[PDB]
Design a binder for this molecule. Structure first.
Ligand SMILES: C[C@@H]1O[C@@H](O[C@@H]2[C@@H](O)[C@@H](O)[C@@H](CO)O[C@H]2O)[C@@H](O)[C@H](O)[C@@H]1O
Ligand SMILES: C[C@@H]1O[C@@H](O[C@@H]2[C@@H](O)[C@@H](O)[C@@H](CO)O[C@H]2O)[C@@H](O)[C@H](O)[C@@H]1O
Lengths: 301, 299
């Protein structure tokens, strides 16, 4: 079964680490880096890793039951899976699938629709934020702590968190949270990735997301877009080597813009060619060319 | 080129009319209906219709500039992908626009690009009443309302929908995309079962609500992944009707069968005021090209 990439253009793709369209391709203009995101992790032959799940509108969302305590009001959410199934902390995952995979304050909206009590069917929704550095950000153990200026939430009812953007200018998108809290190490992580040779850089799909105040840039970079995650998962094409050579092509003219290594683990490297911003034709997309190996030498893009 | 469907299960699919996962399959328990949604419209050979665009998180979003300022927020629109919006495009409205009558609540946000505080941001809850006379996304403008006056005129502004802003949704009643003046144009066609005893099968989401008892139902004809799939595959339709079966991949058992119409919607044979029970690992599979005379087994 031949390996293929979606034929969606850049403006037609979704970030796999935040619910947002892709705004541009991006390489670090300073140096090469090492990164270990847990959303947006899929091997070329279709193996999901980390906390990666398939629904683009559920990335960095949470679902569960509000548990009352004992100006910002604390909201302890006892989690279930995003698809509604019970959350099992013994699963071999770093945290509930879809959990926020970086240190920062994410603002969003928490909503409820009552299923028990004297007001079944009554609803409410308000802005909240989740600080993933909080010691009670413990999505591996099955709970997260939100905060809201509103006290208008009902104890014991189904509660959903939908992320919107930066709730403070404090994002560190490549620093993993402590998914089990302060006294347990992360486990079952998708591996760290980095260029294997000097002169290469990871190529990211970058989104710029909203911010609720301050001057935060809102950058969230993913290794492959969510549509690629969905595509590889369904195709499950055998990988014929550790490295697929791909090219950004203009499908209307056949012109090759630049080449890149698509690693079997599910990320892209390019040859460094300076701090120049990346400009591609808006009708262009990546196309699989051939299976190669690590000794392939990329031409500067 | 052979026609295929994605193999994603129900809990792995996205609504094409609202940014939400699919919760269940649904048919009208009362009668057959006629519907004309403008998002989630793609023919089986990959022709997008209505206001349908490809990005699942952008459905019912708006992007634009705040021109002037419950505090009113007048937004001059661009396309969601950032390109200028041309009101003479042969579309009912800017792609992704809300395609029903109701109050949609969400968050409006800004990041300044001009003036004395370039880079400064803000974001607050807002709502958009698509029955408002100034809900005119075809002309290129929408009116939002917010409790906060912390918004900057002349700056890029984005609306992200969350759910019901009031218990006033009519998901099958199209808004007046140009206001009370002009009739709607360039609409994706109405769809309905062609025979008594058939019903449209919907992919249903239950979305949030900011107060009241609204049900939050948003039904789409095909999920957004199917839209994306048909758009890319562009497989020629060999007949007006593809036979599809909802299958259990573990057992190979056909749970039920359905007609997938070339226009991009599904009908099933009515089997009474039946709740729909399907296995969580199941998905639809293309079986064969048939025709309108195919008799579906009652669901
Ligand atoms: C840059 C501004 O950000 C927000 O305002 C801030 C307030 O929310 C508050 O945190 C105070 C405390 O220092 O700082 C303000 O800058 C926005 O509300 C405002 O419109 C600006 O974008
Ligand atoms: C069912 C309830 O809805 C909301 O409360 C409403 C208020 O926000 C306000 O609109 C008043 C107007 O009279 O009506 C209330 O019903 C929720 O905030 C509340 O928690 C209930 O779910």
């Amino acid at each position: 079964k031949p390996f293929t990439l979606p034929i969606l253009t850049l403006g037609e793709l979704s970030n796999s680490r935040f619910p947002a369209p892709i705004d541009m391709l991006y390489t670090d203009p300073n140096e090469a880096i090492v990164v270990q995101p847990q959303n947006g992790r899929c091997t070329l032959d279709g193996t999901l890793q980390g906390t990666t799940q398939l629904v683009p509108t559920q990335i960095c969302s949470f679902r569960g039951t509000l548990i009352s305590q004992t100006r910002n009001h604390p909201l302890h959410v006892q989690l279930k899976n995003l698809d509604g199934t019970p959350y099992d902390p013994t699963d071999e995952v770093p945290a509930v699938l879809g959990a926020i995979d970086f240190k920062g304050t994410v603002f969003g909206v928490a909503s409820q629709r009552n299923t028990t009590g004297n007001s079944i069917g009554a609803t409410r929704a308000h802005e909240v934020h989740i600080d993933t550095t909080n010691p009670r950000y413990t999505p591996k153990l099955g709970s997260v702590l939100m905060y809201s200026e509103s006290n208008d939430f009902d104890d014991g009812q189904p509660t959903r968190f939908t992320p919107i953007g930066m709730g403070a200018d404090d994002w560190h998108q490549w620093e993993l949270p402590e998914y089990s809290g302060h006294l347990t190490l992360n486990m079952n992580l998708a591996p760290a990735v980095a260029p294997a040779f000097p002169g290469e850089r990871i190529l990211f799909f970058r989104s710029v997301v909203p911010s609720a105040g301050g001057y935060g840039s809102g950058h969230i970079d993913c290794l492959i877009p969510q549509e690629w995650v969905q595509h590889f998962y369904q195709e499950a094409a055998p990988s014929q080597s550790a490295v697929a050579l791909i090219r950004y092509v203009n499908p209307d003219t056949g012109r090759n813009i630049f080449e890149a290594k698509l690693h079997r683990e599910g990320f892209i490297t390019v040859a460094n060619s300076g701090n120049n911003p990346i400009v591609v034709p808006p009708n262009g997309y990546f196309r699989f060319e051939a299976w190669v190996n690590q000794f392939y030498t990329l031409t500067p893009m």
